[PDB]
């Protein structure tokens, strides 16, 4: 296998989804902070360059009508990654793409909380991407965790799937966002919620013909500031283990994450239009939208009737290893620290990546 960048339109072939329907019958949401004006121009460049029909989009001011929904310049790279990776992974079509924009002038984290709340209250998007997060202990200390978990609980009960990036700091989420900290490990919010699917990161190798070859843990070591870039993974210190995770024996009574993983290494990342220029980007910010687009295909294959899938993933995959690419090599720390990948579920990558046609067949036979 070779490590190289990929057009998001390649993710269906890589994850065995070409034979599934597109997500043309499923509405997808993206949570953003601030506006998406440049992102929508970059999305038009993406669909037009790839010869695809245009995507129907809507933007939603989730807070005060007088709030600040101006574009955040750095934010546009995130919304570009999320929207292009979803539409590519979805097979080039989604019913509608809804951007739930957080007010930037709201106090604390309340703008973001209100963006989650609007997506759940409206209950129009079946699958919602969240390529964001921060140390769960900080979210817990100011009340954000508690408030937002209520919203995600409502989402799961009404059959919506939030997909949340597990983090880019490996095990060192709470150490100044990714500075090595020896044996002290931590995880990201809202990925640690049991009411969302947490998505970690791989290094993706493809064959000379573009087919899947293998995946290892995403860990690209330290940047020039000394910050680690690697997949978030571990367990929450606050959230109890939901019972479907009992199949991973020998783990604490806490929510273990991530659940599944997809491509995240910048060196094997996605080629994304950002302010008109193509850039090769990674992060678990990539992995989550890949899952969102693929999962929205399976919703369209099933009349949008698949409920929150965490318990089903754990029962199906633990009993049916052919549904995943099991990542077995690498670690998500530094200097000998961190968790190691291995057979079956592991802390860097969870169950690994989904083989979508095999999972679709499983759902046809068994339901989900
Ligand atoms: Ca594994």
From Swiss-Prot:
Changing residue 263 to A: No change in activity with casein as substrate. Residues 2-366 form the Peptidase S53 domain. It catalyses: Hydrolysis of the B chain of insulin at 13-Glu-|-Ala-14, 15-Leu-|-Tyr-16 and 25-Phe-|-Tyr-26 and angiotensin I at 4-Tyr-|-Ile-5. A good synthetic substrate is Lys-Pro-Ile-Glu-Phe-|-Phe(NO2)-Arg-Leu. It is found in: Periplasm. Autocatalytically processed. Binds 1 Ca(2+) ion per subunit. Ca(2+) binds at residues 326-327, 342, 344, 346. Its EC number is 3.4.21.100. Keywords: Calcium, Disulfide bond, Hydrolase, Metal-binding, Periplasm, Protease, Serine protease, Signal, Zymogen. Changing residue 82 to A: Retains auto-processing activity but shows only very weak activity with casein as substrate. Its cofactor is Ca(2+). One of its GO terms (biological process) is proteolysis. Disulfide bonds join 135-174. Changing residue 122 to A: Slight decrease in activity with casein as substrate. Its main location: periplasm. Changing residue 223 to A: No change in activity with casein as substrate. Optimum pH is 3. Residues 59-78 are annotated as: Disordered. Optimum temperature is 50 degrees Celsius. Stable at temperatures below 45 degrees Celsius and completely loses its activity at 65 degrees Celsius. One of its GO terms (cellular component) is periplasmic space. One of its GO terms (molecular function) is metal ion binding. Inhibited by 1,2-epoxy-3-(p-nitrophenoxy)propane (EPNP), but not by carboxyl proteinase inhibitors, such as pepstatin, pepstatin Ac (S-PI) and diazoacetyl-DL-norleucine methyl ester (DAN). Inhibited by tyrostatin, pseudo-tyrostatin, AcIPF, AcIAF, chymostatin and pseudo-iodotyrostatin. The active site is at residues 78, 82, 285. Pepstatin-insensitive serine-carboxyl proteinase. In vitro can hydrolyze various synthetic peptides. Also shows activity on acid-denatured hemoglobin and on casein. This is Sedolisin. The chain holds residues 218 to 585 of 587 of the full protein.
């Amino acid at each position: 296998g070779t490590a190289k960048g990929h057009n998001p339109t390649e993710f269906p072939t890589i994850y065995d989804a070409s034979s599934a329907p597109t997500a043309a019958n499923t509405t997808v949401g993206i949570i953003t902070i601030g506006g998406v004006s440049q992102t929508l121009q970059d999305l038009q460049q993406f669909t037009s360059a790839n010869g695809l029909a245009s995507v129907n989009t809507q933007t939603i001011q989730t807070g005060s009508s007088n709030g600040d929904y101006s574009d955040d310049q750095q934010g546009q790279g995130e919304w570009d990654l999320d929207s292009q990776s979803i539409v590519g992974s979805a097979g080039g079509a989604v019913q509608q793409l809804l951007f739930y924009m957080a007010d930037q002038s709201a106090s604390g984290n309340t703008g973001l909380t209100q963006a989650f709340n609007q997506a759940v209250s409206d209950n129009v998007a079946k699958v919602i991407n969240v390529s964001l997060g921060w140390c769960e202990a900080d979210a817990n200390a100011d009340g954000t965790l508690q408030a937002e978990d209520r919203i995600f609980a409502t989402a799961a009960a009404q059959g919506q799937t939030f997909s949340v990036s597990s983090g880019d700091e490996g095990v060192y989420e709470c150490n100044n966002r990714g500075y090595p900290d020896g044996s002290t490990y931590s995880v990201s919010w809202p990925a640690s919620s049991p009411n969302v699917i947490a998505v970690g990161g791989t290094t993706l190798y493809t064959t000379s013909a573009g087919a899947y070859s293998n995946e290892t843990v995403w860990n690209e070591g330290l940047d020039s500031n000394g910050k680690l870039w690697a997949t978030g993974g571990g367990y929450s210190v606050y959230e109890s283990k939901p019972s479907w995770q009992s199949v991973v024996s020998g783990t604490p009574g806490r929510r273990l994450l991530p659940d599944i993983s997809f491509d995240a290494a910048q060196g094997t990342g996605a080629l994304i239009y950002n302010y008109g220029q193509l850039q090769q980007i990674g992060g678990t910010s990539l992995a989550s939208p890949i899952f969102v687009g693929l999962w929205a295909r399976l919703q369209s294959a099933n009349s949008n009737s698949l409920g929150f899938p965490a318990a089903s993933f754990y029962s199906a995959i633990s009993s049916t290893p052919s549904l995943v690419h099991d990542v077995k090599s690498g670690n998500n720390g530094y200097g000998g620290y961190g968790y190691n990948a291995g057979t079956g579920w592991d802390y860097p990558t969870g169950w690994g990546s989904l083989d979508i046609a095999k999972l679709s067949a499983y759902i046809r036979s068994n339901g989900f």
